[PDB]
Symmetry: D3
């Protein structure tokens, strides 16, 4: 199953991301279940918002919110929930939510999948609008769900993103 | 063309709404052009948000923002931009934006189109979530567009909605 | 507007069909308004059914149900409501509904648009499943709408279809 | 795999439903294969009909038609085939088909996923149109498939639905 | 109708493009009819190809193929056939087809619609992949339609694109 | 998982095909991963092309390109990536690509799923356009990916298709 997908071929520079939610999709917040590897409906989000990129996680990692580390993956066409994409980290939106520190990595498709993103080396190379849209999404998408909240702490670079990937991997390792 | 569509068969209780944007659609903000009756792209909205209902206007009306009065129309399936739907007003979100007072009517499909909405007589009969989603949309959808802004002033009932329809009609009449 | 589209380049063998409803679409029953040429929502259909083909009419014709003659147009991909397709009649489903005799022509895309349908010369060349699906649709799609009903009278050939096209044209002519 | 999903967290009041067919989808009748847990095409349905709700089953149950008990799940947006949704039973359409007694449960998203359905406590709280659409679907969707048929026996309440869930669970247990 | 849309607010730098075909759509080749302003199906294209950008024309212009000058418009989300978008020319693919010289302009959404494309000043600023995809599309999309063909002659810059816009306008003027 | 799906119920006449890419979809080239059974993004294809049929493979087979044998499956509606369809082989497009001989089987839905394809007994019964579209797709879809290429060698009949299925099965058996 997806439970057996490696974190990556050469972490943290070469990772696999398991997709749960496509970019620009209906507000169904799917999460993979750790036990079964199945896609569960976590919730129907209450705001009229969509994820600006495909959204998922790195397998065999653990954030402080008790889930694998979260990843946004821009692509030319939305991905299928439950599919896996090889990518390269380029930046990270630091943020905290009701479940703990909960960073949002941005990783682009690996050069082997496409040349489209090769030019995006670091966080400054991401379009300013996309970055603004992502921060605005995480700032507001929980606005109508009581007991759910976010404190966005800011954008950081590809090396901070890599550091977060290592830490999350090591954390799933030693817990 | 759509330029020749009546405001309604018996205003303000029985109106026609010209749809510009479907519910739950991509963030393309279409507006009908007054001159040609064609659907123009006003803009690509910058936030990752969607209209909670189909969105358009009552022909032969004028708001203080210099456009025909705006209407949200809930339906079971999204409508085609440029189509026209017979409806019944049930409530209004009072609000102001950078172009003037700019109320958002809510009108449901007429009984003749469907029985689904007959039970919605007044604003209190609208689902609380939908109303919350609409106010949250108008509060935030201009957050990333400089020089565009909104002050949401609150929900009011079917009679206030009807009053607004009359006023907007009379205004297109005497300007 | 669509109000000015000819019935066809050489009726009844070479016709234009104005599309109102795409094949396999949501159950929104659009009808063009004769006055304005705009697409109106006639109703939200109540059964969980879809049109097996794109559905519309021949302009400048009149059936006994007081509307232009109805046409089903099979295509490889669903058409846009309000678009126009050049076609060739191949058969007709005779039927009556609450508004009068109300035949359903089947016309395929003209050879100039595609070679795909050239082999369909007459009604027997239509797939048996499609014909069965169309009759079953018209038999049941009004089952949950009181005061709406259908009596399906059977399939007839391309020459009967042509005769119906002529009659409907002549009727719009002399009324 | 989906083969390992529990019937529920607290049956019969708190269940999981494995979705096979989304609401308002193309007429591809997917069924999960018991052996592999994969989604198989059972058939391409022959009528021009769609499921009024998402459709699937409760894992680790068995109906008299030799399959897990069937469930319809209304949601605001169609679900992905192969996804799992936590729900609450509210009613049941009793019916028989060519494979045995084959009830159709209706279960709404659990409060934890959404508040939208909390107000639906029992079968009378379901919209009359949706219930009519579901009965009409099961009455007719097999009309063009020889050797497939249905006898719809009627709507019953949340306690009958719960009783059916218990019986189906116990049956998978003791066979 | 769309027949009355200006070529632009300040040609050739500020133009309007009437869209006939969305980006990444089914292979239905719609063309606006000059007489009626309606969207007609020109043909169902025979290759398994899609337009890499939204496709349409500048009103009140004339190419040597006897149609208004053709335009590709990249956008973040596909546009509706029959809609109009304000844009800025940035490049041109020179090519000839069976109907005459038939250049393909590329024009991006005007800054007023979006800031996304402001950075694209000239043809070299267009992504190399998109340009390659467009040339490959026009080279092959007529491969399976006998009597239809293309000779692609190459990419040229924003000033050549502007020159072509002027010439096409002047040609509709003096014929 | 899909790793455990049989090659078929009675090879080579009665096979199962695991679908990776739907017909007429976005150009995301998914491949099932042999290790995990998960759907991976192999690449984002560079040409503006789509698969004319659903595309996938026969499990427990091996081609000379080191992957299971490839299959195109025409259906009335596109299939879900990761779903499985029972089918009957009717023809084969012989071709070679950069990874080895790499035939493309065509197999239609089994009679048990639908009667629609029963009339297609052999390769000559496939529509000429579909066959032309498939050959044109494989001839050009790698045109913009350096180091990827195809030599299409021609269409052959249902018995050649069956022979290829046997050979590929036996090859996965003895390697
Ligand atoms: Cl790992
Ligand atoms: Cl979060
Ligand atoms: Cl930002
Ligand atoms: Cl009026
Ligand atoms: Cl507004
Ligand atoms: Cl509110
Ligand atoms: Cl005429
Ligand atoms: Cl009818
Ligand atoms: Cl029949
Ligand atoms: Cl269980
Ligand atoms: Cl059933
Ligand atoms: Cl009922
Ligand atoms: Cl002009
Ligand atoms: Cl061309
Ligand atoms: Cl190029
Ligand atoms: Cl096997
Ligand atoms: Cl290949
Ligand atoms: Cl061929
Ligand atoms: F998470
Ligand atoms: F407005
Ligand atoms: F009619
Ligand atoms: F079942
Ligand atoms: F043209
Ligand atoms: F392969
Ligand atoms: Mn959305
Ligand atoms: Mn969560
Ligand atoms: Mn997560
Ligand atoms: Mn979180
Ligand atoms: Mn998280
Ligand atoms: Mn959206
Ligand atoms: Mn505006
Ligand atoms: Mn407005
Ligand atoms: Mn406004
Ligand atoms: Mn306004
Ligand atoms: Mn439908
Ligand atoms: Mn009617
Ligand atoms: Mn009609
Ligand atoms: Mn009728
Ligand atoms: Mn009629
Ligand atoms: Mn459908
Ligand atoms: Mn079954
Ligand atoms: Mn079942
Ligand atoms: Mn059954
Ligand atoms: Mn059953
Ligand atoms: Mn396509
Ligand atoms: Mn042309
Ligand atoms: Mn053109
Ligand atoms: Mn041309
Ligand atoms: Mn041209
Ligand atoms: Mn496509
Ligand atoms: Mn490959
Ligand atoms: Mn393969
Ligand atoms: Mn290959
Ligand atoms: Mn292969
Ligand atoms: Na979407
Ligand atoms: Na909250
Ligand atoms: Na949408
Ligand atoms: Na703003
Ligand atoms: Na559909
Ligand atoms: Na009726
Ligand atoms: Na649908
Ligand atoms: Na039957
Ligand atoms: Na598409
Ligand atoms: Na050609
Ligand atoms: Na598609
Ligand atoms: Na190549």
């Amino acid at each position: 199953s997806l439970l057996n997908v490696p974190a990556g071929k050469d972490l943290p520079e070469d990772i696999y991301v398991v997709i749960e939610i496509p970019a620009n999709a209906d507000p169904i917040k799917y999460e993979i279940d750790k036990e079964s590897g199945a896609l569960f409906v976590d919730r129907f989000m209450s705001t009229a918002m969509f994820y600006p990129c495909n959204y998922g996680y790195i397998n065999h990692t653990l954030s402080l919110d008790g889930d694998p580390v979260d990843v946004l993956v821009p692509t030319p066409y939305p991905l299928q929930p439950g599919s896996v994409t090889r990518c390269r980290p380029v930046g990270v939106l630091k943020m905290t939510d009701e479940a703990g520190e909960d960073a949002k990595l941005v990783a682009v498709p690996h050069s082997k999948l496409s040349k489209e993103y090769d030019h995006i080396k670091d966080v400054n190379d991401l379009p300013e609008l996309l970055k603004a849209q992502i921060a605005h999404f995480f700032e507001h998408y929980k606005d109508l769900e009581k007991g759910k909240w976010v404190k966005v702490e800011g954008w950081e670079n590809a090396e901070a993103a890599k550091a977060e990937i290592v830490a999350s991997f090591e954390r799933a390792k030693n817990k």
